[PDB]
């Protein structure tokens, strides 16, 4: 309400368009020894310190979850995107590409991302179950599908009568306080009777659900060709912030789409299984945009997502991919995204192979 000037918080200011290329002037270059963060190349220890795990569900206490179309991710220093070699005779040959950052994820495996949960959403990493207290809420996994066919599961550990979880997929723009299907960008199942919920509309084109159901979830979206028919460029936003005691990265998320025309992604579908037994097709009409597996809680619902290598009734398809596979695929993809952005800003020129892949 003042002017096109300094950011809304004096805690950290990013370089405005008039202060272009202003890197986040957060912590000073003068660091303390510390000792705990003095890991070297000879030691074998994961620098991403996961919090203490507790059998009772807990809350991430100092994480400002996504809002206003503003995505929030973990940050690590990464003082140099590694390009160190011998001192070449030409002192103007190589570029260090000092991004001084990375999207390192606080996860041993592809799990339910804590960055995209509601403040009323509790997790227990003993089974990575998710639970709530009042009404409905939504959580999502770490990964997100953009093409191909894949598959995961949800295991339900507690379903009292006043406890009805919902399980399915949701694109970004999905308000994580809504019950996973209240908008047109989410398609789920209600875990009282198998009922497909989308646009808050319930449809009985489905089988029946059981209290101890280990439910399999198969979903096939077309390649990014039929998804976009154009450039699927991924120019990323990256902003450095130093929240109360830790460094984090902000990126710009998508905006609420007013899409009211139906253009289904070609040959995309969703299939639901009960313990591998085909519960049937859920949604053939699938809108564009990346999707991610999501779970909605009612009052005190206990469910958990699960990947493929520890499966119970897996499909024997050679094309579908477990949660972990697409997870590390997207992780490596965002690594290359950081690489390319630091290249763009740091070294003149860019170049990519024969487009098709």
């Amino acid at each position: 309400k003042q002017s096109s000037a300094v950011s809304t918080s004096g805690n950290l200011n990013g370089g405005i368009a008039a202060g272009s290329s202003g890197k986040g002037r957060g912590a000073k270059r003068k660091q303390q020894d510390g000792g705990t963060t003095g890991t070297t190349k000879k030691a074998r220890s994961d620098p991403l310190f996961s919090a203490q795990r507790l059998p009772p569900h807990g809350y991430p206490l100092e994480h400002p979850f996504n809002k206003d179309g503003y995505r929030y991710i973990l940050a690590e220093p990464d003082p140099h995107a590694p390009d160190p070699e011998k001192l070449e005779l030409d002192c103007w040959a190589g570029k260090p590409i000092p991004g001084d950052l990375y999207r390192a994820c606080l996860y041993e495996r592809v799990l339910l991302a804590l960055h995209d949960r509601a403040p009323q959403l509790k997790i227990s990493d003993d089974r990575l179950t998710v639970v709530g207290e009042k009404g409905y809420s939504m959580v999502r996994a770490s990964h997100g599908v953009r093409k191909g066919a894949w598959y995961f599961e949800i295991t339900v550990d507690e379903m009292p009568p006043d406890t009805a979880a919902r399980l399915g997929w949701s694109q970004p723009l999905g308000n994580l306080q809504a019950p996973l299907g209240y908008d047109k960008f989410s398609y789920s199942w209600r875990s009282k009777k198998g009922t497909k919920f989308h646009q808050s509309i319930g449809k009985h084109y489905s089988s029946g659900y059981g209290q101890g159901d280990v439910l399999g979830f198969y979903i096939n979206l077309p390649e990014d060709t039929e998804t976009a028919k154009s450039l699927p460029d991924t120019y990323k936003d990256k902003a450095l912030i130093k929240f109360k005691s830790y460094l984090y990265f902000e990126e710009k998320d998508f905006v609420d789409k007013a899409e009211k025309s139906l253009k289904q992604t070609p040959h995309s579908e969703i299939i639901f299984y009960k313990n591998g037994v085909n519960q049937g097709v859920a949604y053939k009409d699938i809108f564009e945009g990346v999707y991610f597996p999501a779970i909605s809680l009612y009052k005190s619902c206990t469910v958990s997502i699960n990947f493929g290598p520890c499966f119970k009734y897996p499909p024997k398809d050679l094309t579908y991919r477990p949660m972990s596979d697409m997870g590390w695929g997207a992780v490596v993809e965002h690594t290359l995204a950081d690489v390319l952005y630091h290249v763009e800003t740091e070294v003149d020129g860019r170049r990519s192979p024969p487009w098709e892949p």
Partner: protein, 333 residues
Amino acid sequence: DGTLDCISMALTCTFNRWGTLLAVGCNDGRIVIWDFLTRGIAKIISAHIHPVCSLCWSRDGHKLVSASTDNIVSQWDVLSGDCDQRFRFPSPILKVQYHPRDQNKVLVCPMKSAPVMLTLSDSKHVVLPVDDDSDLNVVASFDRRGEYIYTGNAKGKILVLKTDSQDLVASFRVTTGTSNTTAIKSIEFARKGSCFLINTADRIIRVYDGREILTCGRDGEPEPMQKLQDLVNRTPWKKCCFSGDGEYIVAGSARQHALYIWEKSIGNLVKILHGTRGELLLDVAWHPVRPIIASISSGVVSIWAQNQVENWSAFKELDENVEYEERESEFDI
């Protein structure tokens, strides 16, 4: 909490059977029968030239017994105001009391002599017995039904007689704790149930249940239902009374012109009402079927009511914030 300018020299008041009228005595010796609903005086009776210090309604409400300071007792029809009967005694009368179940009969507590029970049909009188023969100051009262007579002396002795035979049906002396007696200031009963109270010279009100005295027999040790006092100020009580139901008890601190309100079962102090620091508290009464309390102080009457949450607070009124209970289909179509 609301006074009346239309009456002067208020000295003693008495509710009718249903708490609709209030007969107040005045220093001129007049009865002012004032109405609650119309909030106006209903009748004026030239009772005595002498102020009236004792007033009681009849059960039908058509008779009022009045006692002048001239030792002149007189019965008056409330519709006409005529002196139905008139009697005079020695040892000026301290109190009169219609019999609750026989308005023909009326007990009278005089100053120095024993209380005597008279009838209106026949101008006879039955002198009630006195234990110690030397009290010279014994208050007496009918019970709720008029079946027994409770007489308390200046020496803490308490006799329960039967109203018809005057035979000693129970007895006990109250204690000051250690070993001493105390002047029985007054005996009050509940219009509902059987709990009654005693105001004594120790400034300590003692609440009992008459059945326990009856089963205690003569010369026993009945404990009170409750013991009530101002542990803070140690204030005497000029006049006390139950609530209409009998679960609230009020005492009038004439020392500081205040009103203490305790409960019956627990006995904890409900509240305190403060009057004009310059007013001398004289008389206290409770509305028999309302949380309304009449006070007579320095010849002026004040009214103390108690209202509910409504009269402006009645959407659906709530007191504290309510977390909405979201449903399963709360977002469903």
